[PDB]
Amino acid sequence: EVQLQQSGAELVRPGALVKLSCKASGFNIKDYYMHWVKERPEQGLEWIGWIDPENGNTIYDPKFQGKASITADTSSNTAYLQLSSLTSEDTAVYYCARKRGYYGPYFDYWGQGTTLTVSSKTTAPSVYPLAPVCGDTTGSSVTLGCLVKGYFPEPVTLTWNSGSLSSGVHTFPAVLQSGLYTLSSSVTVTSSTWPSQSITCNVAHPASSTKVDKKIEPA
Amino acid sequence: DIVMTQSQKFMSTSVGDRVSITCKASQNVGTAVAWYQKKPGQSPKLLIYSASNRYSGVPDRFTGSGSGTDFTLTISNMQSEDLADYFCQQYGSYPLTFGSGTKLEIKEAEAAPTVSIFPPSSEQLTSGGASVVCFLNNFYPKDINVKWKIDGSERQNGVLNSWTDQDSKDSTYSMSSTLTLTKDEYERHNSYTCEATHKTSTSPIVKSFNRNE
Amino acid sequence: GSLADYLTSAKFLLYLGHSLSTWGDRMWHFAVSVFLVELYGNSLLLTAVYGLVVAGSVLVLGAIIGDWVDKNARLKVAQTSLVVQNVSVILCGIILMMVFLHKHELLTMYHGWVLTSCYILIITIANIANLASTATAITIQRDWIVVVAGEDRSKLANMNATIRRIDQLTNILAPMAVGQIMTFGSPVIGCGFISGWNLVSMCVEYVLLWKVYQKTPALAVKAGCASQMAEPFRTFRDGWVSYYNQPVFLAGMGLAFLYMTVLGFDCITTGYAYTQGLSGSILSILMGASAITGIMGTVAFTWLRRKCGLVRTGLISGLAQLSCLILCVISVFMPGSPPIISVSLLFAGVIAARIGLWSFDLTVTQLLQENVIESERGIINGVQNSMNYLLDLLHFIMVILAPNPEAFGLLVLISVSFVAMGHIMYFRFAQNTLGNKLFACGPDA
Ligand SMILES: [Co+2]
């Protein structure tokens, strides 16, 4: 069982120094070429460079020449990626790969991947539920939605009507605005019981322990 | 360098049909093309190397072909476990370049959006912030245009639209468009409407909410 | 304890088998050379024709041999090739025995009809033996060595260097031993020794190959008129296009171009030395120096690979060889043939070219070994051999066209040029692998 493990969950301020590790179990890095690959979110796969742990020869891609530095330690059997002069464009997921020769056919084994995010400030989520009940005509489908805004450097979990869990609740992906994050969860499985039975959505942010539950009220 | 271009970014398919993904090279790479498949949230896997040879463990339904500039990966019978992102990589020359990637999604009958516009939140308004959010519930085609008309004006500033992923059970998409404005900006208006334009019908579906109401 | 373990290990058995095979091959080659120089006289035309025949046959059959090696079991291919080669050498030795026994009779039996028949029969048998030897080299030095080494490049380089040293030592030793045997007795006894040695070596190498296959369990796993001739042509075309499309095409191209030379020591260079008035003892000590510099090139290649890297090692070897070749180019324009300065400088350049060339050859063969898929090793190696012998065929043609000493210097220049071309081509390959970090050896700092 050949395995490659990496560190994870890296949060860094702009313009700093970042170090990623890649520990190999089941083989020796000395007999292989160790490559690093970067994946920007909603983007393609980009190649950083490669290193030969036997002698220390490291070759980089033209773009990641003055920004990345690949090192290796054979005794600990671990490769290292050093990132300097970090910018907001560098938030991505980094993979550690193994290659046989100079022109090896394939990358047989990959790493789990390390998530690197560069940001400025941290904050707590703000929940502002709102369900339109003004000028309603049909009560056969009540689509009640809750919007969480100002989430600072963290993913939030929104559970709508935890007492009666339903599959009709869709949680749209959070988007970045003004350095913070915004998300919205909308449930339309209310049917006719929604106008009378109380429905409450609870937003939990692990990074700030701000688990706040708000019940949607009629307008 | 060698630029690898994959034409299609979203290929719509059904279970049990052959799937062909193309990969084009800027120069003559020869037979040095390797195909990788990756599911969302996991490391990329190995399917085919040297554009024809299948790796040990890959199912036989994956077949690679092509040479020189054009390459193609074919799946004889699509299954639910083959919906992922596939890309091609060359190793003829350095630096190594990867493909843009192609995402495979299932096919379903066309559906119309179930739009719903929510008024600005009272709690947010008391906090000096106005956010008008309109949610389209279910619609099969990914492409859907959202137009926000405030006081009969097509405002195209400060609007963010987020679309969910393909639901496994229903094979339907959802979208949420939010426009952020100050309390004064919301006050200085009378008509607030959101119009969704999809391929289901030529006439856009418009849902409105009067400012006075 | 440790000595028994080393003598029982797979590496030692492989070394022993290769040493026996190369010793027998060199003995048979010297016997054929003696037959040619004595029975037909010192004719360069006949030797060039024999080289032309063997080079063309390998050029045509290289892809077929590589495909056959690729699409069959490892033990069966090696055993069949060894048996074929040894049987061919034994038959050639018996034929040479019968020819040498009737020396005066065959020289006066007829106008030369029987003599030409013997010549063509010997040439055909030698061609078959050379094809078998090429198949054995492809199946052993490219397939079995990598599997035995496993995931260790230092071990692979050490095995390649030891193979090269064994080849150099047997090249410098076995002709001398068989020549002493011939001169103490008669050529018939020499041919008998050739035949008996080849038979015993056949049996011993069969047993040794069985032992090597048993000791390494990773050799049992392998990952994959006109109508009659349709498929060999398809195999030839597919192999050549696959070789052309390989990313290590330039390195093999340069290695093949390096064979286009007359600046060796088994070529007409010795004839030129004789025509310049040099005794045989000088030639013997020069051959010894060439072998010593070959060993030096092997050890230098190992050290340079360990310290700098494969591509930079190839570049350094190429630069060294080019310096030696420009020394030779300076030599040819010195006073002498169109008095000792010219030949002295030429020989020094040749020896230093030998060391540089051996380093470059080791680098290129390791590059081909470690960057080729195991399902296409044989066909690529066969096409590489075909190109090498194509360049050798061109060299034989050139030697045929200009036999006189007076133009020999001109020939030398041509050789030099081609060598440069090869290295230039390798340089391009280096760029495609290294870019702007070409002249930087060691860890980045
Ligand atoms: Co030979």
Side-chain angles (χ1 to χ4, degrees), chain A residues 1-122 124-125 129 131-132 135 139 145 150 153 155 163 168 173-174 179 192 195 204 206-207 218-219, chain B residues 1-109 111-113 119-120 128-130 138-141 152 158 173 196 204, chain C residues 1-224 226 230-445:
Chain A
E1 183 183 29
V2 169
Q3 201 185 141
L4 314 107
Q5 279 282 347
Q6 311 182 190
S7 58
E10 279 293 344
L11 177 80
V12 169
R13 301 210 80 256
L17 202 286
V18 171
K19 185 103 162 252
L20 276 35
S21 52
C22 165
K23 169 129 180 273
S25 147
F27 75 99
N28 308 61
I29 60 170
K30 156 192 290 233
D31 326 290
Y32 279 96
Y33 291 69
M34 297 300 320
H35 295 228
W36 288 86
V37 173
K38 147 191 210 73
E39 184 178 31
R40 186 136 18 95
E42 66 97 38
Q43 219 69 6
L45 273 282
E46 315 232 36
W47 182 71
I48 294 139
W50 65 259
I51 191 182
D52 194 307
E54 217 195 18
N55 44 301
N57 283 355
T58 89
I59 262 56
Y60 307 62
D61 174 275
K63 282 163 318 304
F64 312 92
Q65 199 141 2
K67 157 167 294 326
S69 156
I70 309 170
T71 36
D73 189 26
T74 320
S75 152
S76 34
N77 220 14
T78 278
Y80 298 98
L81 182 31
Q82 177 109 319
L83 277 166
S84 95
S85 67
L86 273 274
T87 200
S88 100
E89 183 265 329
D90 284 8
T91 88
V93 158
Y94 294 89
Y95 299 104
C96 180
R98 190 183 69 152
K99 177 92 80 141
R100 190 39 191 288
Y102 274 135
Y103 295 97
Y106 44 71
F107 285 129
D108 37 355
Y109 287 125
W110 298 59
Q112 52 180 329
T114 304
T115 324
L116 210 183
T117 36
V118 317
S119 285
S120 293
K121 202 32 148 54
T122 56
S192 147
Chain B
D1 38 13
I2 307 189
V3 152
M4 299 255 138
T5 305
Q6 295 196 340
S7 325
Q8 291 289 331
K9 286 217 60 60
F10 290 99
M11 262 176 193
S12 171
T13 59
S14 28
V15 202
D17 313 331
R18 291 182 69 263
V19 165
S20 71
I21 306 145
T22 81
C23 178
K24 178 166 320 318
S26 78
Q27 339 186 336
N28 189 353
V29 279
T31 191
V33 156
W35 285 92
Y36 299 79
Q37 163 235 39
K38 135 156 99 175
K39 272 134 154 295
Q42 311 193 349
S43 96
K45 266 207 32 182
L46 190 31
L47 296 199
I48 310 282
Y49 64 101
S50 265
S52 159
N53 304 358
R54 149 187 337 132
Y55 196 49
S56 326
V58 202
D60 310 349
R61 86 196 75 136
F62 299 91
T63 36
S65 42
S67 265
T69 86
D70 292 34
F71 298 91
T72 165
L73 169 160
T74 70
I75 300 176
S76 40
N77 296 313
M78 160 78 45
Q79 312 200 44
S80 265
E81 62 248 24
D82 311 321
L83 312 147
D85 217 63
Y86 301 80
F87 29 91
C88 51
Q89 167 223 343
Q90 48 99 6
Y91 55 95
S93 71
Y94 280 58
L96 287 63
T97 41
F98 278 98
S100 299
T102 318
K103 217 167 326 304
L104 299 212
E105 73 283 334
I106 23 73
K107 228 164 162 35
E108 187 227 14
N138 278 321
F139 53 101
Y140 160 63
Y173 289 21
Chain C
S2 181
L3 192 61
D5 296 344
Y6 182 74
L7 266 86
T8 297
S9 37
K11 297 195 311 179
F12 181 72
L13 295 189
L14 210 50
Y15 292 156
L16 205 55
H18 177 67
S19 152
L20 294 179
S21 171
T22 188
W23 196 278
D25 201 58
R26 221 65 47 161
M27 281 215 256
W28 156 65
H29 276 289
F30 189 89
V32 144
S33 176
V34 154
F35 149 79
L36 226 58
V37 64
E38 212 296 326
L39 216 81
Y40 291 75
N42 195 43
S43 300
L44 294 327
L45 187 129
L46 278 306
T47 283
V49 160
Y50 166 58
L52 230 42
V53 162
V54 297
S57 37
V58 169
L59 191 162
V60 160
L61 265 39
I64 310 327
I65 277 190
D67 194 328
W68 174 70
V69 165
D70 210 352
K71 288 187 174 176
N72 280 271
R74 275 145 149 129
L75 188 55
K76 207 239 290 192
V77 159
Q79 292 189 337
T80 299
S81 63
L82 174 99
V83 168
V84 162
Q85 150 147 36
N86 283 123
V87 163
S88 297
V89 174
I90 288 162
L91 251 49
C92 177
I94 299 292
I95 295 301
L96 281 182
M97 219 170 285
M98 268 289 138
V99 152
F100 269 157
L101 267 154
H102 306 89
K103 163 63 91 43
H104 178 310
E105 263 330 274
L106 221 72
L107 251 201
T108 186
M109 266 279 321
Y110 200 58
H111 313 305
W113 147 240
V114 286
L115 204 67
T116 52
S117 178
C118 295
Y119 181 68
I120 69 102
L121 183 132
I122 289 296
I123 262 53
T124 300
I125 296 297
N127 189 190
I128 300 175
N130 196 62
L131 289 175
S133 174
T134 286
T136 306
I138 292 175
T139 198
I140 287 315
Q141 271 162 43
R142 312 303 224 229
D143 222 320
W144 286 37
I145 279 289
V146 178
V147 188
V148 169
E151 286 284 2
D152 211 329
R153 324 194 256 156
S154 167
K155 188 148 118 152
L156 194 93
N158 287 3
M159 296 204 240
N160 289 13
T162 46
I163 290 306
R164 275 340 190 282
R165 303 162 178 144
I166 289 178
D167 259 317
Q168 228 66 246
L169 240 40
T170 191
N171 249 304
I172 200 44
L173 262 163
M176 149 181 319
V178 86
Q180 265 267 346
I181 286 199
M182 249 160 224
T183 206
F184 255 44
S186 58
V188 174
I189 313 296
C191 297
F193 186 73
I194 306 269
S195 284
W197 172 275
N198 271 252
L199 188 64
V200 172
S201 157
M202 157 192 300
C203 293
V204 166
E205 290 158 321
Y206 206 96
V207 161
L208 282 194
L209 257 53
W210 186 9
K211 281 314 192 26
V212 170
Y213 184 78
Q214 259 214 9
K215 253 133 181 176
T216 294
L219 286 163
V221 292
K222 180 178 284 291
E231 42 277 7
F233 180 71
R234 189 169 315 283
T235 288
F236 194 81
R237 216 181 47 74
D238 265 356
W240 274 76
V241 301
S242 195
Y243 188 88
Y244 169 67
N245 286 0
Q246 216 99 348
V248 278
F249 175 73
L250 267 299
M253 253 298 143
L255 179 59
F257 269 49
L258 268 195
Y259 280 52
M260 168 31 84
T261 184
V262 290
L263 307 209
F265 227 91
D266 60 325
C267 206
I268 58 181
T269 168
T270 62
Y272 180 78
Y274 251 110
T275 61
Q276 293 326 268
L278 259 50
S279 147
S281 63
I282 300 297
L283 265 303
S284 100
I285 59 196
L286 283 176
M287 287 225 201
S290 155
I292 278 191
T293 36
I295 309 302
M296 259 169 168
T298 57
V299 60
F301 155 75
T302 63
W303 189 73
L304 273 174
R305 177 217 100 237
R306 165 177 325 310
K307 216 257 164 162
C308 267
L310 217 43
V311 284
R312 293 181 184 81
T313 300
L315 271 166
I316 294 158
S317 326
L319 250 52
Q321 204 203 353
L322 261 206
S323 313
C324 317
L325 270 275
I326 73 101
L327 202 290
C328 258
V329 164
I330 272 170
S331 162
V332 57
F333 282 115
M334 269 295 79
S337 173
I340 53 178
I341 40 171
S342 180
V343 283
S344 299
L345 264 68
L346 193 81
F347 286 147
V350 165
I351 306 287
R354 305 305 317 296
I355 164 175
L357 158 83
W358 282 122
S359 185
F360 188 82
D361 190 345
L362 275 165
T363 293
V364 169
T365 183
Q366 173 125 3
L367 260 166
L368 262 192
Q369 260 168 270
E370 101 186 326
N371 305 276
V372 157
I373 58 198
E374 83 149 9
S375 100
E376 291 176 356
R377 270 170 196 166
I379 206 156
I380 298 306
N381 294 303
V383 167
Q384 171 70 27
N385 280 281
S386 296
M387 281 269 319
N388 298 4
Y389 280 156
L390 166 57
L391 269 322
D392 216 38
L393 195 147
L394 222 64
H395 142 62
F396 279 126
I397 285 187
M398 160 179 46
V399 165
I400 263 178
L401 282 181
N404 62 46
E406 202 267 351
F408 166 80
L410 190 275
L411 286 201
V412 156
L413 286 159
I414 301 304
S415 80
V416 179
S417 148
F418 264 82
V419 159
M421 250 177 304
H423 292 302
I424 278 190
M425 285 174 12
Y426 185 95
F427 186 77
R428 146 67 37 101
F429 169 68
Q431 293 204 45
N432 296 353
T433 320
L434 251 56
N436 321 339
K437 283 190 70 123
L438 265 165
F439 318 106
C441 170
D444 193 20

